[model samples]
Target: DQQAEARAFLSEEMIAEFKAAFDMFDADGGGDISTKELGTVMRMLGQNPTKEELDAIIEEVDEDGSGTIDFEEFLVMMVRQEEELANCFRIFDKNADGFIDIEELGEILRATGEHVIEEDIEDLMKDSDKNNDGRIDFDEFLKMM
Candidate 1:
């Protein structure tokens, strides 16, 4: 029953990916995510989503108007965000090759007209380049996180 319409809309690969993401988000394994924990996750990841901002989106993000987000809500949110997420990676990629390299990141920062110094890039690449796998593309970018 659960697989009926959902499977019709998303391939198995997509389903697995979203399920994996939900697992990561809901560490308590409660099969649901709270806005409080979600905010904590964001802040821990160097994201600064103001309470107001999160609340603003949560109003529209939650399907059932539930204060906390369930698997379906998170899944739908990711689906709706399919395009905007790419913008972050797109801005990071200056080589236009869709992958962000270690040293290449610094140059991209300058290319973006940001007032970032080398140290900032060093810190960024420290965490962002992460796995030493390097060359982060669209999928790998979020995958790395």
Candidate 2:
């Protein structure tokens, strides 16, 4: 079964870590995980998966198709994607103005439980802000990535 394939991808240590994470998320221990619960797990993992990416993972992992994730499911989702590239311009393109901004960076980092300092944010913007207009476009975003 696909679930078994999912299970096969994990190392023993990853199993323990994944279980620890899932158990922390299964606060009610109802054997299921809600979006909010999963979000907490994502934050702890420092994952910046976009909402779409997250949804894709969720849809794939919520194996019971019950609109929720379980320990096994979460493990499957994360293990498969752990080494994937960590940025999505469309996800960070908050303003849809063909540019990225500090607010976008803040949102993405906050999704990973990283509260980027304003000064640090400014520095990133400064470094990536092309055109000297104090923001990031796709080219700049890609370069930063």
Candidate 3:
């Protein structure tokens, strides 16, 4: 199912964005990100890894001893990153169980935002929503739970 989902969720622009980032690091037009270019990738994202860390990080994604990351490798990593995210939301799901709890409702709604409604709370907790025509808050959520 995720094959379908994985393909669908990857919008054209999203892939383009991913490619764009890769292209930048692929500065020499060599069609891959060299180990040195990989340095900047980490520096900007957060920490500046020492030689030890970069070696470990390279081993994590390099796929071979080439010490250069091919676009396919980068793509695979990013796509898997995206996969873990939605499925993580699925972690909260009890999968069509009778109802939702206040703790999860608050946490999920907060993380997903009001506009992005999952089917999780469709069975219940919408009573306050009936009143809101738009929404309610944690206070009412606690009462409902």
Candidate 4:
């Protein structure tokens, strides 16, 4: 009940947008959306996935193996994505202080061992530090995203 209420708190326009998106993916007018439709969704979202990757992605959410994703399955996918975002936030918050300081953010960027320039790190901190406290809390992180 609480979860439903929480969902309800989201504006009707946002809910309608999701429903519209789902309808767009339901090309055949069937209640379930096919893997092909999902592939298009991924592509539209700037993810260029191969056939195998698309199939694997669908497999992850197709709980009943019905070869398609129903609305409930789509909701599960959204929740899992949220959980992933939360996990990523926790990972960057080295001290678990509910926020990531500039140092921690730099560390997270460098954790990939990529060539991250110092100036870029500073810029990221400046942009994402909504509270101007030189740190980014989970809410700030979401806003940054």
Question: Largest lDDT belongs to which candidate?
Answer: 4
RMSD of each: 9.1, 11.1, 10.0, 5.0
> What is the descending lDDT order?
4, 1, 2, 3
| Candidate 1: segments with Cα more than 4 A from true spot | 1-7, 82-145
Best by TM-score: 4
Stretches of candidate 3 off by over 4 Å are 1-17, 44-47, 63-66, 82-145
What would the TM-score be for candidate 2 when compared with the true structure?
A: 0.40
TM-score of each candidate structure, all chains considered together: 0.46, 0.40, 0.44, 0.55
Better candidate by TM-score, 3 or 4: 4
Tens-digit lDDT track of model 4 for 57-122: 778766666566776566545544466578988988879988777887777678899998999889
Task: Score candidate 4 by lDDT.
Answer: 0.72
Query: Model 1 has how many clashing residue pairs?
Result: 0
lDDT of each: 0.69, 0.68, 0.60, 0.72
For residues 10-127, what per-residue lDDT tens digits would candidate 2 score against the true structure? 8777788777766787875677787766666777779755666666766766667756676776766775661222346666776676666667777677688766677886676676
Q: Could you tell me the lDDT of residue 131 within candidate 1?
A: 63
Whichever of 1 and 2 has more lDDT, that candidate is 1
**Residue-wise C-alpha lDDT for candidate 3, range 1-145, written one tens digit per residue:** 4344555667777878888888877756687876677677667678677866676777877555556677666766676673333344345544434333545555776675666444555535555565653343333434543
- After the best TM-score superposition of candidate 1, give how far the Cα of residue 100 lies from its true spot, in angstroms: 28
